[PDB]
C-alpha cells in the first residue's frame, strides 16, 4: 500500500504545516502537525477542557463506530518549547492520504497548554519519530508509520515541505519526479528515539565549505534550524546589524537586510537553504527587527534540522531494518 497527502503551512511564515487525517467511522477529518521529533498521535477532542479549545476541530470518539477505549491508558507529553498536553487513549481507524491503519492509538487530550489553545489551525500532532518515545502508559503504543510499515510497498515515508506553499507527505514510495539529482543517504542513530544523523559541515552564502561533524535530528515539528553557537555566529556575522537579543530570545536582524544562503552537508552532497527561507519576519507587528530562522542550539542539548532546513530538500525517512535518512535537492 501507499498514501499521499498534501501538507500546508498554517500561516504566512511557515510556522508549522498541517496535513488532513481521517479518524474514525464515519471519518472525522482533523488537521494534524506531522512531527518527526515525537511519537504520539494526539488530538483535540470532545474530552478536552472546554476553556482550552478555541477554534480547533475536535475528535468525538462516541460518534465513531470503530473507536474503542484503551482501558487504563493515559498519556502526557512536554515539548521543547515548554508546551504540553495529556489525556486518555482510544484505538480507532486512521487514514492518511489513502493509507489506512486499523487499531491506531489515538490519544485524546483532556488538557492542553496555552500555546496549543492559541493555535486554532492545529488540531493535534501525528508523531513520526521512533515508537520508543511514545508516552502512553502503562502500555506504550506504536506510531502510525510503525503500524503501517509492514503493509507499505517500501518501509519509508518522505517529507517534501514547501516554502510559503503546500507540499507533500508520501508513505510507502519515493516520488522520483519530486527532486533533482540523486538522493544522498546517511546513517541514523535511533538511540535517543529520533531520526538522528550527522551533517558533514556547512557554508555561509558563497563562502568556503567548513568540514565539521554536526549531530542533529531531522524534525518536521520544529520550525527553525538550531545549530551550534559557533556555526550560528558565523552565519549572522555576514548580516549587517544582526545580533543575538536576550530579550527577544535569539538572533534578530534588520528587516531591510538581504540574507545569505546557508548550505549543509549530507555526506559528500550539499543542500542549499536560500536566504529568504531564513526570514521569519518582524519580531512584533510593525517592527523593523526581524527574527532569524537559524538559531543556537545551546541549552536545547541537541541540534535540530527543523523546517527551515528540511523544506530546502526532499527528505526520505527510511524505516528499513537499519533506518537511514535521505536528502535530495529540489
Can you tell me whether residue 23 is helix, strand or coil? strand
Q: How far apart are CA 298 and CA 245, in angstroms?
A: 14
Q: Which residues on neighbouring strands pair with residue 245, listed in sequence order?
A: 250
Asked whether residue 161 falls in the same domain as residue 15, the answer is yes
Can you tell me whether residue 233 is helix, strand or coil? helix
Helix then strand count (H, E) for the chain reads: 4, 24
The answer to whether 55 and 149 have CB atoms below 8 angstroms apart is no
Asked whether residue 77 falls in the same domain as residue 95, the answer is yes
Elucidated via: X-ray
For the annotated catalytic residues, the residue numbers are 35, 199
Compute CA distances 226 → 39, 164, 181, whole Å: 20, 20, 27
Note the resolution in Å, 1 decimal. Answer: 1.2
Task: Extract the C-alpha cell encoding 240.
Answer: 549587517
Which stretch of DSSP H or E encloses residue 209? Answer: none
Task: Identify the CATH number of the domain in which residue 305 sits.
Answer: 2.40.70.10
Task: Extract the C-alpha cell encoding 75.
Answer: 498519556
Asked whether residue 148 falls in the same domain as residue 196, the answer is no
Can you tell me whether residue 324 is helix, strand or coil? strand
Task: Tell me which residue of 101, 96, 115 sits closest to 32, measured CA to CA.
Answer: 96
Boundaries of domain holding 320: 175-330
Q: How many domains does the chain contain in total?
A: 2
The answer to whether 268 and 200 have CB atoms below 8 angstroms apart is yes
Backbone angles phi, psi at 229, to 5 degrees: -55, -35
User: Other CB atoms closer than 10 Å to residue 86's CB: what's the count?
Assistant: 18
Q: Could you please report the per-residue DSSP string of 24-65?
A: TTTTEEEEEEEETT---EEE-BTTS-GGG-SS---B-GGG-T
Q: How far apart are CA 90 and CA 78, in angstroms?
A: 20
Asked whether residue 186 falls in the same domain as residue 204, the answer is yes
* Exposure on the CB side of residue 148, measured as CA atoms within 13 A: 27
Asked whether residue 110 falls in the same domain as residue 213, the answer is no
The strand pair at 262-266 and 269-273 is best described as antiparallel
User: Other CB atoms closer than 10 Å to residue 148's CB: what's the count?
Assistant: 24
Q: How far apart are CA 209 and CA 232, in angstroms?
A: 14
Q: Give the domain-ending residue among 124, 141, 174.
A: 174
Block residue for cell numbers 531564513? 278
Backbone angles phi, psi at 278, to 5 degrees: -95, 0
Asked whether residue 259 falls in the same domain as residue 319, the answer is yes
Asked whether residue 124 falls in the same domain as residue 228, the answer is no
Asked whether residue 230 falls in the same domain as residue 141, the answer is no
Q: Give the domain-ending residue among 127, 147, 174.
A: 174
Amino acid at each position: 500500500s501507499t498514501g499521499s497527502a498534501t501538507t500546508t503551512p498554517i500561516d504566512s511564515l511557515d510556522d508549522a504545516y498541517i496535513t488532513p487525517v481521517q479518524i474514525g467511522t464515519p471519518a472525522q477529518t482533523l488537521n494534524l502537525d506531522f512531527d518527526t521529533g515525537s511519537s504520539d498521535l494526539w488530538v483535540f477532542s470532545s474530552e478536552t477542557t472546554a476553556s482550552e479549545v478555541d477554534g480547533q476541530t475536535i475528535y468525538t470518539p462516541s460518534k465513531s463506530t470503530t473507536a474503542k477505549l484503551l482501558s487504563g491508558a493515559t498519556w502526557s507529553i512536554s515539548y521543547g518549547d515548554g508546551s504540553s498536553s495529556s489525556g486518555d487513549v482510544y484505538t480507532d481507524t486512521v487514514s492518511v492520504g489513502g493509507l489506512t491503519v486499523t487499531g491506531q492509538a489515538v490519544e485524546s487530550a483532556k488538557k492542553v497548554s496555552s500555546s496549543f489553545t492559541e493555535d486554532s489551525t492545529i488540531d493535534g500532532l501525528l508523531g513520526l519519530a521512533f515508537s520508543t518515545l511514545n508516552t502512553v502508559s502503562p502500555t506504550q503504543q506504536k506510531t502510525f508509520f510503525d503500524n503501517a510499515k509492514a503493509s507499505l510497498d517500501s518501509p519509508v515515508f518522505t517529507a517534501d515541505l514547501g516554502y510559503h506553499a503546500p507540499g507533500t507527505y508520501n508513505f510507502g514510495f519515493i516520488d522520483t519526479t519530486a527532486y533533482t539529482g540523486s538522493i544522498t543517504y546517511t546513517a541514523v542513530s535511533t538511540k535517543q528515539g529520533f531520526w538522528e544523523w550527522t551533517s558533514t559541515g556547512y557554508a555561509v552564502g558563497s563562502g568556503t565549505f567548513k568540514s565539521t561533524s554536526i549531530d542533529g535530528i531531522a524534525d518536521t515539528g520544529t520550525t527553525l534550524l538550531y545549530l551550534p553557537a559557533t556555526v550560528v555566529s558565523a552565519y549572522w556575522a555576514q548580516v549587517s546589524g544582526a545580533k543575538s537579543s536576550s530579550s527577544v530570545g535569539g538572533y534578530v536582524f534588520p528587516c531591510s537586510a538581504t540574507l545569505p544562503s546557508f548550505t549543509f552537508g549530507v555526506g559528500s552532497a550539499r543542500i542549499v537553504i536560500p536566504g529568504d527561507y531564513i526570514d521569519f519576519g518582524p519580531i512584533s507587528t510593525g517592527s523593523s527587527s526581524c527574527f532569524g530562522g537559524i538559531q543556537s542550539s545551546a541549552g536545547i542539548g541537541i541540534n535540530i534540522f527543523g523546517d527551515v532546513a528540511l523544506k530546502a530538500a526532499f527528505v526520505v525517512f527510511n524505516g528499513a531494518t537499519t533506518p537511514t535518512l535521505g536528502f535530495a535537492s529540489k
